[PDB]
Amino acid sequence: TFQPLNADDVRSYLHKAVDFISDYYKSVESMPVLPNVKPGYLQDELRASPPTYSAPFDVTMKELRSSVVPGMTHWASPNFFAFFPSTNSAAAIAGDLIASAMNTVGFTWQASPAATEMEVLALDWLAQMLNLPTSFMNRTGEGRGTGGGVILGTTSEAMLVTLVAARDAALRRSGSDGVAGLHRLAVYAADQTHSTFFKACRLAGFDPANIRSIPTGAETDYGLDPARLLEAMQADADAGLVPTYVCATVGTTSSNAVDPVGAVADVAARFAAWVHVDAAYAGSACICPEFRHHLDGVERVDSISMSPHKWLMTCLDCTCLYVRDTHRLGEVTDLKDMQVGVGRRFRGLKLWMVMRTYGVAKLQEHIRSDVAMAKVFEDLVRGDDRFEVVVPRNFALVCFRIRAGAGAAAATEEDADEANRELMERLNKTGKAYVAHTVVGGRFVLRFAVGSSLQEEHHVRSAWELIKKTTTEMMN
Amino acid sequence: TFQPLNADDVRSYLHKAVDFISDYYKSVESMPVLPNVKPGYLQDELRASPPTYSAPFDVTMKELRSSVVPGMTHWASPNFFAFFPSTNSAAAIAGDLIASAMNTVGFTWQASPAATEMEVLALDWLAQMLNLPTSFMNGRGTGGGVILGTTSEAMLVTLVAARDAALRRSGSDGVAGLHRLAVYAADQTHSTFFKACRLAGFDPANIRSIPTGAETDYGLDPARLLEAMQADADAGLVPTYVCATVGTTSSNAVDPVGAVADVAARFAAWVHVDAAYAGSACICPEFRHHLDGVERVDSISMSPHKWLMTCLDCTCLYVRDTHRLTGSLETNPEYLKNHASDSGEVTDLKDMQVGVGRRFRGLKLWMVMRTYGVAKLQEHIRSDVAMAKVFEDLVRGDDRFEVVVPRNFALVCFRIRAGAGAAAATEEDADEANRELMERLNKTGKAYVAHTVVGGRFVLRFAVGSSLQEEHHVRSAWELIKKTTTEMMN
Amino acid sequence: TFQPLNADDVRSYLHKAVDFISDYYKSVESMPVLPNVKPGYLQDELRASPPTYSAPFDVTMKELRSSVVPGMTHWASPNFFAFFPSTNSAAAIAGDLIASAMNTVGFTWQASPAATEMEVLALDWLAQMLNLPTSFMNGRGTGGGVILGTTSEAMLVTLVAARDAALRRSGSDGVAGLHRLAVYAADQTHSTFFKACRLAGFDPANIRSIPTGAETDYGLDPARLLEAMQADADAGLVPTYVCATVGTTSSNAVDPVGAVADVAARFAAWVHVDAAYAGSACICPEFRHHLDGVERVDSISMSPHKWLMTCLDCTCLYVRDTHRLTGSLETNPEYLKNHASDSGEVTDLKDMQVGVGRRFRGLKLWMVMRTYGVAKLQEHIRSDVAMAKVFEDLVRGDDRFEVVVPRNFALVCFRIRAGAGAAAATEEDADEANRELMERLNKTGKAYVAHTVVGGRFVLRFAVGSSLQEEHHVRSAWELIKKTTTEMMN
Amino acid sequence: TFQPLNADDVRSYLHKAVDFISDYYKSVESMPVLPNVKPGYLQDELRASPPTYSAPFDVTMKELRSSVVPGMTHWASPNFFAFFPSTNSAAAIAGDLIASAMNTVGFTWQASPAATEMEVLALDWLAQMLNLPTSFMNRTGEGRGTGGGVILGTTSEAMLVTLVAARDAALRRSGSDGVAGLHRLAVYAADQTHSTFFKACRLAGFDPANIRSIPTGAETDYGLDPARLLEAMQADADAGLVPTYVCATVGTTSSNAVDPVGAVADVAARFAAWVHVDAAYAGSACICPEFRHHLDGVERVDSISMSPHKWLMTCLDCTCLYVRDTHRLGEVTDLKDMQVGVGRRFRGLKLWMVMRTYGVAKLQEHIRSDVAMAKVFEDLVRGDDRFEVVVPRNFALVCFRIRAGAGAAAATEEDADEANRELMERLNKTGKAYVAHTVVGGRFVLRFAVGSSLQEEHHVRSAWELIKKTTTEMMN
Ligand SMILES: *Cc1c(COP(=O)(O)O)cnc(C)c1O
Ligand SMILES: *Cc1c(COP(=O)(O)O)cnc(C)c1O
Ligand SMILES: *Cc1c(COP(=O)(O)O)cnc(C)c1O
Ligand SMILES: *Cc1c(COP(=O)(O)O)cnc(C)c1O
Ligand SMILES: *NCCc1c[nH]c2ccccc12
Ligand SMILES: *NCCc1c[nH]c2ccccc12
Ligand SMILES: [Ca+2]
Ligand SMILES: [Ca+2]
Ligand SMILES: [Ca+2]
Ligand SMILES: [Ca+2]
Ligand SMILES: [Ca+2]
Ligand SMILES: [Ca+2]
Ligand SMILES: [Ca+2]
Ligand SMILES: [Ca+2]
Questions:
Q1: Distance, CA of B374 to CA of B380 (rounded, Å)
Q2: Tell me, what DSSP letter sits at residue B66?
Q3: Under an 8 A CB cutoff, do B59 and C48 touch?
Q4: Which one of B269, B318, C197, D227 has the minimum C-beta count within 10 Å?
Q5: For residue A159, which atom of ligand 2 is closest to its CA?
Q6: Terminal CA-CA length for chain D
Q7: Hey, of C38, C53, C69, which one would you mutate to test binding to chain B, going by the most B CBs within 10 A of its CB?
């Protein structure tokens, strides 16, 4: 007699969830962004064992309010300035709600034709927004493309599955008996490429000795030097190793550096190496013509990924992987085999709803207005001699720091490192900001990632006032 | 001025979504479980290109109802009988909705303390329901767990940990020795295990698919496993990892976990238990014996998004030594550093998975257990098992049919017997008669049945438990099987 | 390589269209006659821009069913009771389909001889059914006819011919004298007549709307017309054209054609008879008296696309002297010259209309008469009249209501009487009660009723004859009126 | 008991009509394009009076086959080369079939919301295809335009209603008491503008003395000289007359001349005169970028019309009128009042179906392939010294003639006039062509209008062979 999807519970539980969400967005700014809890706090609030009997959903919701919410970091806060914002939208939430309720598993087209076709559709649509070549598209206006896509959970998963494909292709090219020649394969990326990529390399079975982190410096604004790449790949080829894969990043995590995609593709072409472009964050901006040059040369690379669940208003998970000329690996299917596990939820519905409800023009103005707020902040930092913008701002992330010589409490560059750490910690104690750091050229640097979905320009200006106020109180 | 999370839209879009969900559940039984669409229909109806301008959300919902829903296979239908049902609940849907709205990314504990602490709590609660040994929970314990999206990822990361330890202790020169490692699973083990082996760099020649047969009800014969492992060792290979399945995908065979563990311990091989579907049953004491010996394995996974009313994605992995996983999976990039991670007192769950980011998946799982309670979760397992028993006994009382293997949970494997009619004299005729019966059942729209092969024989699976499905749906499906069969014989 | 008329597409698109039409007629009664859509819904659903690429016609038909049909007011519904019904037939639809496919443009006889000769034949056949004087047909006759799209165009071209003759004979200096010309119609004459006067350059101060009242059942009083014309003449104006209506749009009043003609003949004014709706009834001998005196008028029009089962557009204009029309309307451009036109033996129908091109509209009208015959067309008029009489007598037997004027054809004008209940004590209350009754009836979706004003009183029209409508639809609509009324009183 | 729309008749009558149409298109080429009937033939075939009783539809269809079809001029023939082709499509026919069956009258939005909204939609869509300014559009992507459109029956109706609006506006500007000053208003067009325009002028009440036909000559390829226009409009203004309206034609009927729209608009702006652009035939080509310059300046004119029922595959009737800044004359309505009679059929459904089924790209290639066939013919004529192409070909119409001096039977220019007339008559007697003529610069000229929907390139080449054969047999 127990019906977990009975009509009354479904409507009343979801209505209570929706009420919570409405209130949460209306009040999240009034909360401290970073919570004031210590590890282990939750087990001192909630019972240690699952309850034997059922409770009213109201009891569950009040434990969510009393014990969960106060322990969260509010990514949705307009004063969240860390990492990259997980931008979101009413359409994306509604689409994921509907996918959760239908709860289909699309491991084949037959297991749900609409789910597979919508994932292909959403991928082909976004490929058009990015102005990708037809070689990355499944369906075309009248016919078929020569490429394909799949909606994965993470950029790391995108890296792994393209690493595996490149691995097996190089093993065949080099006459390996199975994996016996795996120790001859080498892989390459700039040292600013995310550390999860080198981890993916190790997961795929590449030898630690042949995984190359190419040093970058400020003379290229920490983008990969194609000459240093060629030098490293040639030396490996000369020594009997097989250059197998290069990851180029458009918009690195630490400082939003940009690797030159076309130059990297040409250098890798000397060795028939696979080239993957990681544009997890900044890829979203490339739907705008004034950012699309960052992907020039993508037509010569083998794969590209970007994550709408960062900067395209689509809640997690949504990472889009595109692969060129898929025939080296009618029926309308995504590349379900370039996926850690086939057998996961209908991720495509929310991405389609985002594009269909808002349209390309609003998606582009969402990018442009975030960039404009980032420029407002960058220009405020540049107007205060106590600070410096440590690298050029390419998108909506600004890297800045208190200079050495700003005050007597920042006399040496070691002093400045400590002052910037103290500033970041003071900002986070106010509850009116969440700032985290990185290291650029040996220096402790504050990141300022503009774009939390609820955040408006006055929030950024107010954050800057707070940075000025806090610095001033520190320096005397 | 464009505000994607403005209060008006958030409320009305979600209310329109809830109205759709309400209607959908009320009307899904009356739709055909399988659609009647051709490949490529969707881009025909929606367009080839995204719109330049915006549209009211009512339009999006209209295209959902008009173009998406008619192309769906309705997993939620009470007449969906294939694969394993994706059981679901109002609480799980509500939890995932709230997690989607808060949309926190919990790669570290600091990135959102409650997201990681609730996941740990939820895993611990499920471990208690499962009566897992305390060595899988977390004093001095090394045990621990992670929610992942899939069994495949759970297989992948334990394969990688086993691989790295084998290469290290066997003196591999980097990965030059990877071609020496060997892995084992019964031939009834899900195909994604063999795929995860290939992902991790294991050599295809060294991935052992151990034959099984009716002698063990297609469970893994431990003597045959010992034979295969010893032979590899004698040949200079390194036996590295064994996968045991409790509740196989095809016929719900159960591998003897304890004896597999004892055999593999002669080689210090990693033992993982895949209980993706049947693990949820083990919250019931009459099924917990299928996990006896888990106290001697290295890892076990099961998916609440199959049989524990928690919408996809939700797969729970438990390990006896988290340090063996984080050794292979951890990173320490500068931009993620924080005092809590430095202190060693928290586990950053990015170090238990492939990726960095992750959703707040603990919320839905906790909401399911917190709202419904153990007793209701147990009765949910039991009532599905009883419905499947009803169907099993119906099949048994009709001499044209046979139950192909013993029924351990809520999947019945059955077949039109050989010699049941003039259109099934041979076994080759029965093979074709069962395929005809399956295609006919699906064509009515009042069933979705898919097949498997059990010992060379074409077999129909009847997987009970779709959340909206009641006993009368199962009885009516049997009547539909009988009547379709009778019409096929003459 | 793109072939818009390839055989495969022509056949399958049209078969899909016929299937839609079949379904539409079978299901239209079950839709609400009036839609429930907001202004602007369509571009929301279809997009703001045309697609770059092609789509299967099945997609076009799907958007027809999903987005167009739900926004329609269903003229074809048996419960459509407003305006005048657009009566239709399988033969007329088939005729227009074939004309659309052959898609000839018949500006001259040579441009397609059969298109013009069948139009002449069809007009002649209808003139016979109407028992028009032979002076309207074509020996030595000057009479003749043209099929036009609208009564408005028929009004326009006869206004222009009358205008040009008045200016010529009254000694206008070019069009300097146009402000001296005057035109007359009863105030019950359709608003498009006064619009056509303005199009032709008549002065708004000189366009006479003669008052009518209950004394003549709102027909034009010829003494009041003579008064208005004589007064204008005495003042130096030139009475130029009079329009008489047989079957007015509001209440189906009938102007006395003979006496209007005799009054206008004292001034040599052009007399046109507008019988757009009721002219089709005059194929029945018991209605032909409404046209007595047509033998003395200059022109008469009526629209088979109202009450003669010929889908829009189809309006027939007859004149006693085609030369008075072609004098104003003809052109002789060089590229259209041909021997048949030069010979004077054919009438190029571009010289009887505003435009150059024209469809083969004679085909549908001829197919209707040829397939069904006069007797069936007569019985079609009579059965509609009898259904309207049924409704009229129902209204009469209920003391809360009144029939407002005598019923001449198949339109009943009725009203909630003053003093019928406590919510209709005054006439101002009855005016509001009838508007409430009308809005309620339409809200049910089982009726579409619209109103008119008869002698300062808010009145409901009940226009019988929608082609799918049977007597039980009329009886059920009366029951719906009674029950809606009763619920309104308390 | 007689149901004219009973289900059996509807299906069987329409199926017989569809069978007829299928056969007709398959066999129309085998018929003589021009029929061999004399005036009055039909009344000698069919009964003189309507039948008293009903007959089976088969009887009706067989009279269509026996007596109607043999008397038709087959506009649908691939060998129809006259006037302008009435191009057509399966989608347009299906849409008009469906409109005929629904049979709604859309004189208000409420009388059928979908019909009005679809007419506005189809107009706004085609305006985008023509790249008309927003000032001619009803709805915009996110908001509203400042203009509007209406789907009329004819170009003449478009002329009349814009003439009326311009007339009443000039009467108010000039202080006229009603129509008392109508004799002061003057109107203008080149002498190549269709004669139905000067007729429309007379219908609207303009004085014959003030209706101006501006002479054109070969020095402008018979396009209107803007200087001659200004000279005529200035002289009228100087004399006390009120210049009220100018019609500019893009693609004249006789020779497809093109009036300079922008220059004409600027000249008319001196006098505040209304400017209408008639592009009945050639307007359809302006959905292609390489023809769109012909409409340069449309942004400064008051109205523009073109007819999809000529060159955009939409069966009659379909003439689209657009009016700029409609506020000088929410709710979504066409300009139903700029229409001779409000109260006509749902013309919009077939135009939408054409655009939705085939898409912009196929509509453009339909224009380009007709033009290409026209160029093939033009180049064949130019390769034979006995002929001349008398004006430049702008679209898919070619004007050509046998020269004087071609043979001894074409020695004087009067002889050539008679030889071209004899050629045209011989071509039409074969039944394998329908050619009609015009006069250009005092000379008898053959028109050759490419584009009948069934016509392919071999049909045009074969017509040229026939012209060569026939000329040769004439000249000896
Ligand atoms: C369903 C099932 C799986 C599915 O694995 P995923 O990676 O989650 O797609 C694996 N193993 C078993 C036994 C199953 O029943
Ligand atoms: C966010 C980020 C990642 C992390 O990706 P996951 O989805 O967590 O695997 C990788 N690369 C870049 C450039 C990133 O910004
Ligand atoms: C319906 C009707 C009209 C309609 O005129 P149109 O120009 O065809 O729209 C005119 N007069 C009368 C009496 C009518 O009943
Ligand atoms: C076809 C044509 C016309 C004739 O228009 P109608 O629709 O018959 O009134 C007018 N002008 C031009 C340029 C034409 O080609
Ligand atoms: N260092 C990674 C930051 C990150 C990882 N996954 C993510 C998803 C969404 C926003 C940010 C993010
Ligand atoms: N001289 C006019 C030719 C013409 C007039 N109306 C038409 C419609 C369709 C094609 C040609 C045409
Ligand atoms: Ca923003
Ligand atoms: Ca809108
Ligand atoms: Ca650590
Ligand atoms: Ca159940
Ligand atoms: Ca297609
Ligand atoms: Ca003549
Ligand atoms: Ca009737
Ligand atoms: Ca063509």
A1: 10
A2: I
A3: no
A4: D227
A5: 9
A6: 71
A7: C53
Chain A environment of C53 (Cβ under 8 Å): 141-142
In contact, B295 and B315? CB cutoff 8 Å: no
For B103, residues 6+ apart whose C-beta sits below 8 A from its C-beta are A75, A76, A86, A88, A315, A316
Active site residues of B: 335
Rounded Cα–Cα distance for residues A16 and A5 (Å): 16
Q: Which of C83, C147, C150, C151 to mutate to test the pocket of ligand 3 (most atoms within 8 A of CB)?
A: C151
Closest CA to B175 of B186, B188, B166, B185: B166
Query: Which residues in chain A are contacts of C54 at CB distance < 8 A?
Result: 142
Contact criterion met (CB below 8 Å) for C127 and C137: yes
Of B366, B349, B354, the closest CA to residue B328 belongs to B354
Q: What's the CA gap between C126 and C279, in Å, rounded? A: 10
Is A187 strand, coil or helix?
Answer: strand
With tokens 């004007």, the residue in question is: D399
Is the Cα dihedral C384, C389, C390, C396 positive or negative? Answer: positive
Closest residue by Cα to residue C290 from C332, C335, C245, C250: C245
The chain C residue lying nearest B53, using CA atoms, is C48
Measured CA to CA, the distance from residue D412 to residue D400 in angstroms comes to 17
Give the single-character DSSP code of B417.
P
For residues C398 and C485, give the distance between their C-alpha atoms in angstroms, rounded to a whole number: 11
Inter-chain residue contact C75 with D105, CB threshold 8 Å: yes
Whole-number Å distance between alpha carbons of B150 and C323: 88
DSSP H stretches of helix in D289-347: 308-311
Q: Strand, helix or coil at A4?
A: coil
Q: Do A113 and B57 touch (CB under 8 A)?
A: no
Nearest to B411 by CA among B256, B263, B306: B306
**Residue in D with minimal Cα distance to B54:** D142
Resolution (A): 2.3
Left (φ > 0), alpha (ψ -120 to 50) or beta: where does D343 sit? left
List A190's β-bridge partners, or say none: A214
For residue D418, count other CB atoms closer than 10 A to its CB.
14
Q: How far apart are CA A47 and CA B207, in angstroms?
A: 45
| Closest-lying ligand 5 atom to the alpha carbon of residue B357 | 6
Across D265-281, b (16+ Cβ under 10 Å) vs e yields bebbeebebbbbbbbbb
Q: Is C83 annotated as a binding residue?
A: no
- CA–CA separation, B464 and B83 (whole Å): 10
Q: Alpha-carbon distance C237 to A243, whole Å?
A: 102
Which sign does the torsion angle of CA A442, A446, A450, A453 carry?
positive
- 3-state SS string over D107-146? CCCCCCHHHHHHHHHHHHHHHHHCCCCHHHCCECCCCECC
The answer to whether the beta carbons of residues C241 and C270 sit under 8 Å apart is yes
Q: What is the CA(B168)–ligand 1 centre distance, in A?
A: 30
Compute the distance between CA of residue B192 and CA of residue A344 in angstroms, rounded to an integer. 13
Q: Which atom of ligand 3 is nearest to the CA of C153?
A: 7
- Please list, in sequence order, all residues whose beta carbon lies within 8 angstroms of the beta carbon of residue A254, skipping any fewer than 6 positions away: A192, A222, A399, A438, A439, A440, A447, B334, B335
Q: Which residue's alpha carbon is nearest to atom 1 within ligand 6?
A: D83
- If one residue of C148, C329, C331, C356 were mutated to test the ligand 4 pocket, choosing by the most ligand atoms within 8 A of its CB, it would be C356
Q: Parallel, antiparallel, or unpaired for β A397-402 and A443-449? A: antiparallel
Residue D52 carries which side chain, given as an amino acid letter?
A: T
The experimental technique behind this entry is X-ray
Q: What one-character DSSP code corresponds to residue A201?
A: H
Q: How far apart are CA B161 and CA B282, in angstroms?
A: 26
Q: C interface mutation test: which of D75, D126, D309 has the most C CBs within 10 A?
A: D75
Please give the distance, rounded to the nearest whole angstrom, from the Cα atom of residue D109 to the centre of ligand 3: 18
Strands D303-306 and D274-278: parallel
Least Cα separation, residue C3 to chain A (angstroms)? 16
